[PDB]
């Protein structure tokens, strides 16, 4: 379970993301 | 014969290596059969699971921005079954991961943005070849811990870049976002991370 942390005033982050074909 | 496993999920471990999971239906099995090879020619791998119970397996020494097709089976004594397909690439050379997955027809990678402690901001970039023309995107929201209620956001438009601010969220608690295009016949796939908003 991997959590990105999101911090106020700190910018845009682009997180990694898993990709999911299905449902 | 075996159904067809209802999902396949990508998760990019580094520049090179990727996290391979699937589920299939609660109704033995052998085990199961995972294949993959570039897509701009390259032999083909095949990995044979050989435990019913393993549902994920991890790949290593994949070449960085190329595309590869993976196509995953589940077998029992009856036979094989159908397979379900996945294209999928790691890009590397904005803060954040240096490596992304990306397919042609899922969103581009997700950029979050904290505006406040609770609301934020999620921008993603239009498919690079999506599977029909795009009505709009659906993301949905939800607390990672479970049990909660999933809130779900229509965005109308094929905007080669998308926006979405989500307000009402709570400092310190992990929020699991997923964004699919939705298209004319269907949906695509969808690309899922978990944030936590902190001061």
């Given at each position: 379970?991997?959590?990105?942390?999101?911090?106020?005033?700190?910018?845009?982050?682009?997180?990694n993301?898993?990709?999911?074909?299905?449902? | 014969?075996?159904?067809?496993?209802?999902r396949?999920?990508?998760?990019?471990?580094?520049?090179?290596?990727?996290?391979?999971?699937?589920?299939?239906?609660?109704?033995?099995?052998?085990?199961y059969?995972?294949?993959?090879?570039?897509?701009?020619?390259?032999?083909?791998?095949?990995?044979?699971?050989?435990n019913?119970?393993?549902?994920?397996?991890?790949?290593?020494?994949?070449?960085?921005?190329?595309?590869?097709?993976?196509?995953?089976?589940?077998?029992?004594?009856?036979?094989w079954?159908?397979?379900?397909?996945?294209?999928?690439?790691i890009?590397?050379?904005?803060?954040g991961?240096?490596?992304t997955?990306?397919?042609?027809?899922?969103p581009?990678?997700?950029?979050?943005?904290?505006?406040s402690?609770?609301?934020?901001?999620?921008?993603?970039?239009?498919?690079?070849?999506?599977?029909?023309?795009?009505?709009?995107?659906?993301?949905?929201?939800?607390?990672?811990?479970?049990?909660?209620?999933?809130?779900?956001?229509?965005?109308?438009?094929?905007?080669?870049?998308?926006?979405?601010?989500?307000?009402?969220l709570?400092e310190?608690?992990?929020?699991?976002?997923?964004?699919?295009?939705r298209?004319?016949?269907?949906?695509?796939?969808?690309?899922?991370?978990?944030?936590?908003?902190?001061?």
């Amino acid at each position: 379970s991997n959590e990105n942390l999101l911090l106020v005033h700190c910018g845009p982050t682009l997180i990694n993301s898993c990709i999911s074909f299905g449902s | 014969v075996p159904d067809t496993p209802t999902r396949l999920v990508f998760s990019a471990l580094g520049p090179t290596s990727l996290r391979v999971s699937w589920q299939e239906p609660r109704c033995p099995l052998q085990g199961y059969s995972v294949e993959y090879q570039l897509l701009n020619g390259g032999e083909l791998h095949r990995l044979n699971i050989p435990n019913p119970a393993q549902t994920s397996v991890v790949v290593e020494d994949l070449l960085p921005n190329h595309s590869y097709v993976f196509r995953v089976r589940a077998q029992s004594q009856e036979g094989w079954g159908r397979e379900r397909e996945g294209v999928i690439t790691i890009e590397s050379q904005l803060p954040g991961s240096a490596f992304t997955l990306s397919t042609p027809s899922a969103p581009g990678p997700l950029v979050f943005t904290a505006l406040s402690p609770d609301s934020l901001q999620l921008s993603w970039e239009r498919p690079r070849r999506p599977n029909g023309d795009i009505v709009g995107y659906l993301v949905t929201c939800e607390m990672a811990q479970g049990g909660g209620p999933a809130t779900a956001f229509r965005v109308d438009g094929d905007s080669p870049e998308s926006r979405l601010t989500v307000p009402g969220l709570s400092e310190n608690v992990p929020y699991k976002f997923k964004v699919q295009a939705r298209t004319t016949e269907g949906f695509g796939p969808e690309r899922e991370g978990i944030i936590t908003i902190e001061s």
